[model samples]
Target: ILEAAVTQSPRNKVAVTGEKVTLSCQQTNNHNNMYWYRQDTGHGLRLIHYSYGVGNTEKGDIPDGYEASRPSQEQFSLILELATPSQTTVYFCASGGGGTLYFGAGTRLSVL
Candidate 1:
């Protein structure tokens, strides 16, 4: 298991712009690809960018909620995971160089 620091901002409840967090992604696929998902009006599914191995990188679709750690070569993604079935979105990704994307989705996740 890994360790994380928990914190919250009480100043703004509904209206907020900034966050304070401490988490890291540790993977060794030579490329720790990052993901960004959002529900759009007409655009439908939009994939952000992919961060290649800490700093050796390629740009994905989305830039927000993403950052690369050079020395670690990992991506620190969004805060929440293990989403409910209703909150889940079907992710379809094509290879940057014609390779298929890794697929993983579940109904009973994160929340219990």
Candidate 2:
């Protein structure tokens, strides 16, 4: 059975400057690849990080201030070590292969 289901936690979040915020995601589809992306008003969604398998993470285009972890086959996380207002945006998680991917609802984050 092939399915696409991705879930993201903390639908909405508010963080203070220099605070550490972590966004979690789980994919029931058991896809081998997972991705983390951020979207701003003017700029379209930009890739932050991705994982090819458990314990294997790769940096994406905008990987300057972000960290990613893949602890297990179904779990992937995005970590913000020191949050800032400039990094405030909507984050998304997805899992799939090739040209087909399923995305989560997205997490809206605001930093004060």
Candidate 3:
């Protein structure tokens, strides 16, 4: 995560991971390497996405999306595949690839 006053997209939210997770981001201004990863709600962590940023201008390098995900939860706590609403991506303007970003695996859980 660059020191460019990290700005969360209008639609970014939530993440779950084991303790000491790292949420990362880079500056599109410098174009350097960056990685983001998180434990999410499953067995292992999930790679949300990545961009080299600025001079780097790469993809899937962010390693701290998990850190960003942690604060997204209202509970302010982490759990093992527990019931909780997690991060979200908001869509604005003409930039989405439709619902293609998500695949239905039919994973279900109880909130109560």
Candidate 4:
């Protein structure tokens, strides 16, 4: 089966201001598109960033103050600099292929 495989780092986090928070991902099936989304109390799933391929990252609708890196086909990472309480939420990483996206379980972040 050619399925997208997505893995994320730090299943949960207690965020701190001005520090770096990371969400890692991997898509073993070589999918060309990957996404990062944040789940909050009001807004359900808000896009943060996405990568079309290695070395190519795009800012999503809600990508302000967030950054991402896709260094290779096997892996990518989402980096949040200067964390804030408003940034606290459940972040999801996903890989897409055949018009379907396969997501990681999730990562919960509480920024204090």
Query: What does candidate 1's lDDT look like per residue over 1-112, in tens digits?
Result: 1332211112111212343322233333444454333334464756544444445444456534434233553333333322333332323222221253432221111122
Model 3, TM vs. native: 0.24
lDDT comparison, 1 vs 2, better candidate? 2
The lDDT leader among the candidates is 2
In model 4, the runs with Cα more than 4 Å from the true position are 1-4
What lDDT does model 1 reach? 0.34
lDDT at position 29, candidate 4: 77
lDDT per residue for candidate 3 within 14-45, as digits (tens), equals: 44432232222312222222333333444443
What is candidate 2's lDDT per residue for 1-112, written digit by digit as tens?
Answer: 1453888988899999899999998998779999999996875889999999999999999998899999999989999999999998999989887766788889999999
How many clashes (backbone atoms < 3 Å, residues ≥3 apart in a chain or on different chains) does model 3 have?
25
Error of 2 at 55 (Å): 0.5
- Superior by TM-score: candidate 1 or candidate 2: 2
Q: Output the better candidate (1/3) by TM-score.
A: 1
Tens digits of per-residue lDDT, candidate 4, 9-81, equal 7789897777788788877878888889998788588888988888999999999889999899867688887
Which 10-residue span in candidate 3 carries the lowest summed lDDT? Answer: 89-98
Question: TM-score of each candidate?
Answer: 0.36, 0.93, 0.24, 0.89
Which has the higher lDDT value, candidate number 1 or candidate number 3? Answer: 1
Question: In candidate 2, which residue ranges exceed 4 Å CA deviation?
Answer: 1-4
2 or 3: which has the higher lDDT?
Answer: 2
Candidate 3 stretches with Cα past 4 Å from truth are 1-31, 41-43, 55-84, 88-112
